[PDB]
From a paper:
Septins are GTP-binding proteins that are involved in important cellular processes such as cytokinesis, membrane trafficking and microtubule dynamics. Many of these biological functions are dependent on the intrinsic ability of septins to spontaneously polymerize into filaments, which subsequently assemble into higher order structures such as rings and networks that are capable of membrane association. Human septins 3, 9 and 12 are the only members of a specific subgroup of septins that display several unusual features, including the absence of a C-terminal coiled coil. This particular subgroup (the SEPT3 septins) are present in rod-like octameric protofilaments but are lacking in similar hexameric assemblies, which only contain representatives of the three remaining subgroups.
Two structures were obtained in the presence of GMPPNP (in space groups P1 and C2221 at 1.8 and 2.12 Å resolution, respectively) and one with GDP (in space group P1 at 2.19 Å resolution). Both of the P1 structures are isomorphous and have four monomers in the asymmetric unit, whereas the C2221 structure has only one. In structures that contain the GTP analogue the γ-phosphate is anchored by the Mg2+ ion, one water molecule and Ser58 and Lys62 from the P-loop, Thr89 from switch I and Gly115 from switch II. Furthermore, Phe116 (the homologue of Phe128 in SEPT3) is always observed in the buried conformation. Both SEPT12G–GDP and SEPT12G–GMPPNP (space group P1) form filaments within the crystal lattice, employing the NC and G interfaces. The filaments of the GDP and GMPPNP complexes are effectively identical. Since both structures have four monomers in the asymmetric unit, there are two crystallographically independent NC and G interfaces. If these are dubbed NC1, NC2, G1 and G2 then they will alternate in the following manner along the filament: –NC1–G1–NC2–G2–NC1–G1–NC2–G2–. Whilst the two independent G interfaces are very similar, the NC interfaces are not [Fig. 3(a)]. One of them is in the classical ‘open’ conformation seen in the remaining septin subgroups, whilst the other is in a shifted closed conformation. Finally, the shifted arrangement (which is also closed) is asymmetric and is seen only in the SEPT12 complexes, where it is present as the second type of NC interface (NC2).
Author numbering: 48 to 81, 86 to 316
The structure:
């Protein structure tokens, strides 16, 4: 069961740390055993399993942008990767016809990391998000959210949500794809919290008898899978549990078909 994720965002926002956090989550039956500034695109693939649901999960890690003087076209490698997977899938459909034998490398969701400035969406992130949402599912997150208080996280989230409407950035789950009243009720709860205020952690700690992922500070451990500490469980549950199939369905029937229709002509 193939599912492909990609992390995107400014350098130094915890993207690579979040990749390891996803694979090391204590909700999987078992975790794979065993980073600095990312210099190349690289994908990790591991068969993970939650109670009943087995997954071949791929997470593509990307070099961060926004450090040079001029960041024009810093979206090309990432957009290039996304369209390459659509191209491979289309060429496989042309050649072998039956999807049973086509490995699905298409990016089913992009997790876009927003700097926890507490202000509003930066023009560079707006430009990147507008280009990304045209071709792939995008779930934005407030990165390294432990640097904001709970109240600051919420106010920043509300401003980002306003910015997304102003610049017409339709992030996942898009309201136009709510197929039912049940979908509207469930997806409105998710849209209320997006962007999730996430914290990443690749280290495990023993806290009150529990082996948990966390960031150890002078004041204690920030437990990244604890809803009282951050909203990583919301991102994790969305991607792997509740909306995995919907993300793949939109990728196949909306984004990939848009690529297939255009390129075939
Ligand atoms: N406070 C805090 N620090 C974090 C968090 N996640 C990662 N960090 C720290 O932030 C730094 C950068 O982490 P990293 O994952 O390498 O960021 P990156 O986005 O992968 N960088 P790049 O794009 O340049 O590879 C490290 O010191 C890491 O320990 C987080 O949720 N909170
Ligand atoms: Mg990195």
């Amino acid at each position: 069961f193939e599912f492909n994720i990609m992390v995107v965002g400014q350098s130094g926002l915890g993207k690579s740390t979040m990749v390891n956090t996803l694979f090391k989550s204590k909700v999987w039956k078992s975790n794979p055993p065993g980073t600095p500034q990312t210099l190349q695109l690289h994908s990790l693939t591991h068969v993970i399993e939650e109670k009943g649901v087995k997954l071949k999960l791929t997470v593509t890690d990307t070099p961060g942008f926004g450090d040079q003087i001029n960041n024009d076209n810093c979206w090309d490698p990432i957009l290039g990767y996304i369209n390459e997977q659509y191209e491979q899938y289309l060429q496989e459909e042309i050649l072998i016809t039956r999807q049973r034998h086509i490995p699905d490398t298409r990016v089913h969701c992009c997790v876009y990391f927003v700097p926890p400035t507490g202000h509003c969406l930066r023009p560079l992130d707006i430009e990147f998000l507008q280009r990304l949402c045209r071709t792939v599912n995008v779930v934005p997150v407030i990165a390294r959210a432990d640097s904001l208080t709970m109240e600051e996280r919420e106010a920043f989230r509300r401003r980002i949500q306003q910015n997304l409407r102003t610049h017409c950035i339709d992030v996942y789950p898009q309201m136009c794809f709510d197929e039912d009243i049940n979908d509207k009720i469930l997806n409105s709860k998710l849209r209320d919290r997006i962007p999730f205020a996430v914290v990443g952690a690749d280290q495990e700690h023993l806290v009150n008898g529990r082996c948990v992922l966390g960031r150890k500070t002078k004041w204690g451990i920030i437990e990244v899978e604890n809803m009282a500490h951050c909203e990583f469980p919301l991102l994790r549950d969305l991607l792997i549990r509740s909306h995995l199939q919907d993300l793949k369905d939109i990728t196949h029937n909306i984004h990939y078909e848009n690529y297939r229709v255009i390129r075939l002509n």
